[PDB]
């Protein structure tokens, strides 16, 4: 099959994917970084996302494995000395499948409708001023967020920022996405929810600015300024993230392996 | 239809219970507390869940209805002067369906295996001593729990005590369970995830003894303390629970109405 | 001086406390445990806590050593290795004074008004029913509490179970006592303030029933039913506890020991 | 007494300013916004704030007063219908000081050593990139804090943004500040105490960066962006802002107005 691996760029991680690549040609494999089918990532988790948004157009045509030279990841997921032994299974397996999420950022005349993919989670701030927006759930005026913003999370994203926040965290089997809030105003004059709310798919949270129209968006490790900003509209991804898997690792035991003991 | 209409007790309920009683004697409905098909609850959500375990061994016979004669309830969710409009739609509606959560408790050689089916939420606490449990997930070891106490949540339950642990909310739409902790105790030595835990249907979760095999569980309402205990067993629950709808009541402005404002 | 070694009962520490009084037995001191000078307690924090409410009423009389045996306790802070040198400077030092919470149960006729003393926190739940009180500081109505209960704490008692209800960790040098909520019912109807409450010395936090007036009160590790309470009062108490200071062991060492890592 | 007004600008404040000024004429009162000794502010607690800092090289020389034409304030607690009876008596009262906060910045060569005063509280983000710093306990290190940020709060201004991070109130008369978090990264490898940490006169906190130098360093409503940094270091400031006291409004009861009910 067509493959290519991405690398964190330090020493350790060059010369694994040197050394993969090197087995990868006793088999009937083909490097191309263009098309792969094989999409491997050696580093971090960090690592791993970009190479997910680097391919983020043919997510149905692409499984991708995460090789971890430092700490467990939860994309990245096994250790270095099963490369060679995960060179061959790969030229010889399973499909898992995880959700994404989708948001929509709407503007003003002179600017289109913007759609990003997120693996982990999208969150909005405010550029400098106070971070006010009326939330809107299915058309349904829910509440009128004050505070430092909101994180919309996908399952396998609930044990990265949205865990920071107090979030719940959700087996990636379940297609939902989870909005958190970020140092919330509550007195008796503003109210929010508090609560983590979690959605199911078709359900659209909508983002709706009350003064300010400019915000910092960011979707997974990148952040935006956006301008002028109309609406910001959450939703499950009808697009699903593809690993190839090679042995099973439940995602309770990742859990546990990260956050209580290895 | 076969039909009977449970009270809170006191006179504003019984009143309007006797008014739709009235009112359903102008139609084809035999008023029959044992096997009904249609349950009224005329009260709080306490007289909601007193009806639902009531009849909890016909649930794919019966569909509920709630009537709050206080404030607003998640389950009794109509107002009493929509009675006799209640009562003309009843004679002629949809259904809708809200998971359920099963708990398996298991003792040693002298008492048989009991299990509980919950509409809210399910707790474990200790009997006096402390509360140490090791929880196991699809029988992986996850963690070892010091505390106060657990809450294992159905989607419609989260609302309710799972919303005063710092649970996140979860659209009933969702076949889901939800994991808080009470009070955990977390040092260099005692460690817990933490994080509310979100499991899908089909995913196992055991809490096994340490120590003091006794405790007190507590289904909804009801609280048991039970003695010698080996094993306790949460999972989604594959009976559902069946609702009337006779109109468009969002499950997120029922939120919105019971917590920011109506 | 007159001096006194308590015990946890199992074979490390009953040796230990030969040996020191034996090597106390090489020196002018006196072995009392009616009138000691000089307490010291050889175990965990649970039995530093016991020694404590052992001597209660000759606090300013008398000066405590914890020695553990287990993990470094926050009252019992010295290893085991330290007890031949911690004999020598106890017999030839400065001392420490943590600040005390009292805690005050009015009942009705025919029961006199009891006071405690807590070194750690005290804490009130409902029995069987639902916890219903309404929170009076200084004679001012400031809410009515719906939940699980509340916990008054200790400054030295914010790294108990003060810390594990979101409580914030204080220096014991400040004279206070912070009030922390346990699942806090909060909607549209029931409002608790949520934050973690620290009042100063001379403030009187008084809880007072609503309908039933039965509460399990725990001081410490004991816990007690009361029954016909018309108030309970929480205030700093006058009276401190005295450390025997052999070393510097600052309070946010101890912390970053206990919980970050040692 | 020398005086003066400062507005929020808009109309009814600056109306209920020039109102007071022709009261102020009918008595011995001269107004001078160079040297007052008494600072009105009338707005809210955000006018409050300005005219703290406007003033803050003469504290020990003006006690402000606050009027709120919006809702209640915790700085401007006076309804604008006492103005009237608030210029007879301010013009013939007591005085009640609150504690403040001290941050200093130190740099690398080039650039010197800058402090800030805060009344309501000092935070500290990255610029940019990720949030690693050191804290320094009294030379100690405690812990590797990775996350959003850090706040450091007054105890007046533990109802304002440390009350979002989950931080306790204290009572004003308690001179300490608070240390939250924003968004702490806690798993395996990255450990934080996760509790607010509150701390005595004399006790400095000292964040030093691992990393980057840059940080966003916001004292109230200020934010500046500080660039090669070396040290930031917190502790209770030897200055207290004064009141001028024309009746009793405890601090608990403003808290009860602003967060529970008026
Ligand atoms: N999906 C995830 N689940 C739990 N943790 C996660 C996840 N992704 C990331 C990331 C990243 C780089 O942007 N991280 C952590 C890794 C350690 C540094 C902080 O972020
Ligand atoms: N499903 C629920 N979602 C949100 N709140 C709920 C729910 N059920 C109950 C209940 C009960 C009686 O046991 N409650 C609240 C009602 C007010 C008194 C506290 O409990
Ligand atoms: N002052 C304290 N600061 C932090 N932790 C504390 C404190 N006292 C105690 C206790 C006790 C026995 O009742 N503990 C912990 C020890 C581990 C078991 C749980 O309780
Ligand atoms: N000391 C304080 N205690 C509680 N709340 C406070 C405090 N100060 C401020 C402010 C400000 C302007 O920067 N606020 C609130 C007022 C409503 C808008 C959010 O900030």
């Given at each position: 099959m067509?493959?290519?691996?991405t690398?964190k760029?330090?020493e350790?991680?060059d010369?694994?994917?040197?050394?993969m690549?090197?087995?990868?040609?006793?088999?009937?494999?083909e490097?191309?970084?263009?098309?792969?089918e094989?999409?491997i990532?050696?580093?971090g988790?960090?690592?791993?996302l970009?190479?997910?948004h680097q391919?983020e157009?043919?997510?149905?045509?692409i499984a991708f494995?995460?090789?971890h030279?430092?700490?467990?990841?939860?994309?990245?997921?096994w250790?270095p000395?099963?490369?060679?032994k995960?060179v061959?299974?790969?030229?010889?397996?399973?499909?898992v499948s995880?959700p994404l999420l989708?948001?929509?950022?709407?503007?003003?005349?002179?600017?289109?409708?913007?759609?990003?993919?997120?693996?982990?989670?999208?969150t909005?701030?405010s550029?400098?001023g106070?971070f006010?927006v009326?939330?809107?759930?299915?058309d349904?005026?829910?509440e009128?967020?004050?505070?430092d913003?909101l994180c919309?999370s996908?399952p396998?994203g609930?044990?990265?920022?949205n865990?920071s926040?107090?979030?719940?965290?959700?087996?990636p089997?379940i297609?939902?996405?989870q909005?958190?809030?970020?140092?919330?105003?509550?007195?008796?004059?503003?109210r929010?929810?508090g609560?983590?709310?979690?959605?199911?798919?078709?359900?659209?949270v909508?983002?709706?600015?009350?003064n300010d129209k400019?915000?910092?968006?960011s979707?997974?490790?990148?952040?935006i300024?956006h301008?002028d900003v109309?609406?910001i509209r959450?939703?499950?991804?009808?697009?699903?993230?593809?690993?190839?898997?090679?042995?099973?690792?439940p995602?309770?035991?990742?859990?546990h392996?990260s956050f209580?003991?290895?």
């Open positions: 067509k493959y290519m691996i690398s760029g330090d350790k991680s010369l694994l994917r040197l050394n690549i090197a087995g990868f040609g006793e088999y009937d494999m490097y191309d970084d263009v098309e792969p094989i999409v990532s050696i580093g988790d960090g690592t791993f970009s190479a997910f391919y157009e043919r997510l149905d045509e494995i995460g090789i030279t430092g700490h467990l990841g939860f994309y990245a997921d250790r000395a099963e490369a060679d995960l061959k299974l790969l030229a010889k397996y399973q499909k995880y989708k948001t929509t950022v709407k503007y003003g005349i002179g600017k289109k409708e913007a759609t990003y993919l997120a693996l982990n989670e999208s909005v701030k550029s400098g106070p006010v009326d939330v809107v759930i299915n349904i005026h829910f009128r967020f004050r505070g913003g919309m996908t396998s609930t044990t990265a920022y865990k926040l107090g979030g719940a965290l959700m087996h089997s297609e939902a996405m909005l958190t809030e970020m140092a919330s105003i509550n007195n008796r004059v503003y929010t929810i609560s983590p709310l979690v959605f199911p798919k078709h359900h659209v909508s983002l709706q600015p009350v400019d915000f910092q968006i979707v997974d490790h990148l952040s300024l301008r109309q609406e959450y939703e499950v991804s009808a697009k699903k993230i593809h690993f190839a898997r090679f042995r099973s690792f995602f309770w035991r990742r859990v392996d209580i003991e290895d």
